[PDB]
Amino acid sequence: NWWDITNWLWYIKKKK
């Protein structure tokens, strides 16, 4: 789902 991509980006940027 394209609508989940920025959530994944946020998680990456955090972890990291």
Partner: antibody
Framework: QVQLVQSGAEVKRPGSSVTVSCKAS????????LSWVRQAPGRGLEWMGG????????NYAPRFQGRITITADRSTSTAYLELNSLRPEDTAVYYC???????????????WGQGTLVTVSS | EIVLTQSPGTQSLSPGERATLSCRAS???????LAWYQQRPGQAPRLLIY???SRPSGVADRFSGSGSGTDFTLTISRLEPEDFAVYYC?????????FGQGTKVEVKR
């Protein structure tokens, strides 16, 4: 606070192409999804497409795929909608909208531009 | 494409009344990615509910969302004068996001 400001009203001839801009301030332009939604007579709200600037990836609604380009300029935090081969049924108010956050993005559109009236007419 | 049906498309209600608005999807909406917006004439839409039941801070707690799968409801516990407006549901559980046709809540007199 996030604010989206759009360019002003346009009159466009049938068959031409229109570009509408949406300048963002506040929050992170690059990592949150920006969409375009229009409001045409008799048709409620209709989602047209969106872009995630950092990835330069777009997602277009099939009804507009082939007629639309959405771009984002990270240097100015401005997103653009191009719509081509204009017809009278494309007369509408065009809004840009950015997803909200809790921060963590929410997908749904919390932040809206003021709208741009595009009139397609001879 | 997921088609969202908002029926009835108009409800005539009295100030102070409870309102329940239906949004029914033609197939299941993934992860309950269902939002509700309010729109008044001459204004941009405003987010009320996301994720079927989550409410942004700033949105009045008289608005609540519920439901799952294909059957979603926006409840307004007590209509204030500013609540007479058009309400749209939107699904974003597939890459192709779609909106319902809206329900106008109008003042019964």
């Amino acid at each position: 606070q996030v604010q989206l400001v759009q360019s002003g009203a346009e009159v466009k001839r049938p068959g031409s192409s229109v570009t509408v801009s949406c300048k963002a301030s506040g929050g992170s332009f690059s990592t949150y999804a920006l969409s375009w939604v229009r409001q045409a007579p008799g048709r409620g709200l209709e989602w047209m497409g969106g872009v995630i600037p950092l990835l330069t990836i777009t997602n277009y609604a099939p009804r507009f795929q082939g007629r639309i380009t959405i771009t984002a300029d990270r240097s100015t935090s401005t997103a653009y909608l191009e719509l081509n081969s204009l017809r009278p049924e494309d007369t509408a108010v065009y809004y840009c909208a950015r997803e909200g956050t809790t921060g963590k993005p929410i997908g749904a559109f919390a932040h809206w531009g003021q709208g741009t009236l595009v009139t397609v007419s001879s | 494409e997921i088609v969202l049906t908002q029926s009835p498309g108009t409800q005539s209600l009295s100030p102070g009344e409870r309102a329940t608005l239906s949004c029914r999807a033609s197939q299941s909406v993934g992860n309950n990615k269902l939002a509700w917006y309010q729109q008044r004439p001459g204004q941009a839409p405003r987010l009320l509910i996301y994720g079927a039941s989550s409410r942004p801070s700033g949105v009045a707690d008289r608005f609540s969302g519920s439901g799952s799968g294909t059957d979603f409801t926006l409840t307004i516990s007590r209509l204030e004068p500013e609540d007479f407006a058009v309400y749209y549901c939107q699904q974003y559980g597939q890459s192709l996001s779609t909106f319902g046709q809206g329900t106008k809540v109008e003042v019964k007199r």
